[PDB]
Amino acid sequence: TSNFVKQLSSNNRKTRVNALEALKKYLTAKQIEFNKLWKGLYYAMWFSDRPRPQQRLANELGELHGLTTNDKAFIKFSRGFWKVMCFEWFNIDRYRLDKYLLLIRRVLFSQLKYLQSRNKLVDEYIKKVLRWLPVYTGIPIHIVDILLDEWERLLKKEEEMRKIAESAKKTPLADVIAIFQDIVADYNNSKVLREKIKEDLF
Amino acid sequence: HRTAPKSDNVYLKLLVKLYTFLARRTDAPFNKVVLKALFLSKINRPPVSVSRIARALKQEGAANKTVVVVGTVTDDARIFEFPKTTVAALRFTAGARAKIVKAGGECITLDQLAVRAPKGQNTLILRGPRNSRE
Amino acid sequence: RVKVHFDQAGKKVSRRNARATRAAKIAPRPLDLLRPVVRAPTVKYNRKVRAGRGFTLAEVKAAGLTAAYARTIGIAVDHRRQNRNQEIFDANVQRLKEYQSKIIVFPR
Amino acid sequence: TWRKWNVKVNHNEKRYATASAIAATAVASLVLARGHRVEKIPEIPLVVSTDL
Amino acid sequence: VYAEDNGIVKALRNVPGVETANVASLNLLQLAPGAHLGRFVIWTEAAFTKLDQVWGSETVASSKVGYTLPSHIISTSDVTRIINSSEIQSAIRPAGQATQKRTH
Amino acid sequence: SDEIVWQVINQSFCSHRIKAPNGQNFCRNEYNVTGLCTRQSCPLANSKYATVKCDNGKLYLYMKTPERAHTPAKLWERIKLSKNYTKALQQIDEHLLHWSK
Amino acid sequence: PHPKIVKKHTKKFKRHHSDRYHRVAENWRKQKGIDSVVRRRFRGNISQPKIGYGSNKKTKFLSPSGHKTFLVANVKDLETLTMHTKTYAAEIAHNISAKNRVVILARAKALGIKVTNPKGRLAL
Amino acid sequence: ILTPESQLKKSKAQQKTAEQVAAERAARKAANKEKRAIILERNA
Amino acid sequence: SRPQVTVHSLTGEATANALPLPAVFSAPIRPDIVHTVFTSVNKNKRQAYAV
RNA sequence: CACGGACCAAGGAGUCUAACGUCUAUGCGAGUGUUUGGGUGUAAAACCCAUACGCGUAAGGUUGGGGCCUCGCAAGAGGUGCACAAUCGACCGAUCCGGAUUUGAGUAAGAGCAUAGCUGUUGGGACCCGAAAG
RNA sequence: AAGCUCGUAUCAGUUUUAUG
Fold this sequence. Notes:
In chain A, 76% of the residues lie in helices and 0% in strands. Chain A is an all-alpha fold. In chain A, helix 1 packs antiparallel against helix 2 (14-27), helix 5 runs parallel beside helix 7 and helix 6 crosses helix 8 (138-155). Chain F has helices spanning 2-11, 85-95, and strands at residues 49-54, 59-64, 77-79. Chain I: Belongs to the universal ribosomal protein uL4 family.
């Protein structure tokens, strides 16, 4: 793993690109390992240019989830993400919040697109998100609005009947918004994010 | 009836440059208290020995409050028994630092306090003992 | 009247030099002399232990060598000091035995 | 001549100022704001192999 | 800078302006030439590594007895990143014109 | 981080700054827009910046970002710009996109 | 353009009794004598400097022709004025040689900056 | 192909404010245009 | 910050090696202190003078 | 009124230090101070530090009470209340037989040390120049 | 000048009103 962490962090484009490649050819083959991989990536995103590629990666680290065994492998593998990211969040730059909000999106969308496969599993996914939404209230603000919108991005006028049939299913979201209502109905919280939810539940 | 802190220290100039803002837009009393107590001098910021914190959390609801000291926190070995709390202040005597973090608590600069609790919701602000000096 | 030492910079350089010559001749020897381990008086300090002047007659004897020779082997001797404390006596004797075992001596 | 020519400075604190002095040798726009045409150096902290 | 001299210092001692210091010392007057920060350093590979031994981090302890690098008064130096954050901008009444409008 | 590099530049001196007889003080850096070292024009404390500069050819728009901040020998990107004043301006506000106003 | 430039007081202040004595010079200095006429401001005496004469922050420091003044040495220095040719005008510190002035001249017309003191040291 | 995403949150909050105030604009037209009645009848 | 640094050869090009940062570069900058420590420390070499 | 001034140039008067301070900053913080001394030195600098020594370290009940929390659009209402203020209980060195009064910037939960800076008192010739005698 | 424990909810070279 250390060779991944260090070949991704290695400041150059090449070593980083090709290290990506290798990791793709790798994960086909524990919590600490996964954390290490993240920080590796987190620094692999730190560099970027000319935003087109700056996006291209945001995809990449999205796709990287597309790879009850893999159930576990990728539930833990995402726990790594939310932990490292809310941790090394607040030490970011002002200008980078561009990337890491974009990436925070492509990720969340990728955890969904996986968990959409067949849909227990989901309940445990909320047994990380539960563990995690309730520090640094900066991020829940982001996954709230982006939550609902990006969700509508999955299921892709009458189209709204296409959703509202598909989302008329509404069960996974019923439990998600159950997580929000969980955090609002409580008494000790942001007192801001509470208000912001009560803007975007509606 | 003051403006800018006596200090040369850049980092409380960026604090001050934050808390003026926050105090202005959020219009909460918390900011005016904390800022208006920031600009003081070195004699006027008695350091708060952590035993006084342990005193203070013995009231009600005190499990949820992030207690705050504009000064520095200085540990005191006259307590072996310390709560789980979360503290925010300018400077921590590494003694106090490791004492809290050992005991289960957390210690974080004023910045991170603002980010967490801009309204200063559900917080507490302790004033270090005053007249005890000459 | 007022003396103000501006040579505290230089005097230490000449003291380094002094010791740099005193080892430019005596070179194998160690500049110094073995010295006892000696408890201090005066209820205040008695708990501390100290460097003394020289070992003693007796401490030198029971360490297996003789005074007039000791002084020439590197030991240092103090004839007006009186061994009493067993323990101090012990540490001294030991310290010599050590010194013995570690030294060499050249022929003539 | 007994005018004070010298000043005692806390030791600990003096290491503080050293620490900071090194730190600014990083930020790479302080290296400019002082002097130092550095714009053509490949990277900062510029670190050259022991071989020197 | 260097770490152990293998014979550099004599090479540079003549060439104008250039000057070296062992890591064990790091003369402040050569780091901060006049209190204007930032000398332009070329570390060497060995010394750069030594530099943890010398100062010490959360892992390697000190080598300067009973010492630790300073703490921070902020958490994070760059402030605007706090203020232009979503995390404050939801706590605060909206804005003004930034240049008012002369009345009367 | 940058605001510090500013404040250092606003108390200590830049290698380059002028202080004209009236109160205001230029910035003689080769790369900057406006030539006044103040918070938003001083190329040394920005980390995101863009100017225009002649080569002796036409006028290359130079750009930088945070990412090459540590790699000065190559930090400034560069673009040429057309001989169509109209098309130029379109190129400029093209590349700059969400770069602030 | 600019407002109309008003000095509020155009006459250089002189030091009390400057002319009746040489051992006294012309640089304004206060009168601390508590008996003096100039200190207590009797009618008909000289006019103290006082803040009210302070000029108009808009046009302060403006040279008459409307520009300000900025004092340059080499060409690399006036290139800071590429932006402001409408506000600052730049002139050439006295010790510049006659060799480099002509350079600052040519290049200073190309940029279209006003040089207040051309014709310094230069014939045709 | 380019979504800056910083400016999004701002565009939403901005938008919501602007149309919170345009409320106060119209409602303030009703308020004033109302006043110019009462105050008049009372001057009479 | 950066997690690690690129050694260079004497020809000047990169090298497979990589070095962590010493985490002395995490320490605060304090142009104040540098200024005081450097007036006091600069005074410390003065040969005396008098008349 | 009385003292100084013919005029020009140059020179020409609140300094330095020591002991106690007050404030402000700075570093650490129940600690605190490297620099008499050692070691090293690119050599009166920088860097490192053993052992000592200087100064410091001898929780009650109520009431009010910055902030907080809750309701309330709002004024206000209810809860928690840091500093200290006060209220009456308290422990200690000194009060006649656990008390009658106190106690002392004593405890009851520490706040100090050191450097810089502006300054203040005192002695040093002590803002400059001028008393006679010894 | 300084502290904070007020801007508390503070008085006044003044008039009244009743008691000299």
